Amino acid sequence: VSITKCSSDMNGYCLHGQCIYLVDMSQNYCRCEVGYTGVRCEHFFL
């Protein structure tokens, strides 16, 4: 449970959500907004 945050030049994927980092699987993690219709928070189906 050791997630880290991203920088200013690291938001090039998730538009509506938060940029973080996974320590168990070192990879740029991006939590999208609950309500979007894609795993990259970009097009609001509602």
- Report how far residue 18's alpha carbon sits from residue 3's, in angstroms, rounded to the nearest whole number: 12
Residues 18, 34 contacting (CB under 8 angstroms): no
CA-angle at 38, arms to 35 and 44, nearest 5°: 50
> Which architecture characterizes domain 1-46 according to CATH?
Ribbon (2.10)
Experimental method: NMR
CA proximity to 29, closest of 45, 11, 8, 46: 11
Chain centroid to Cα 18, Å, comes to: 5
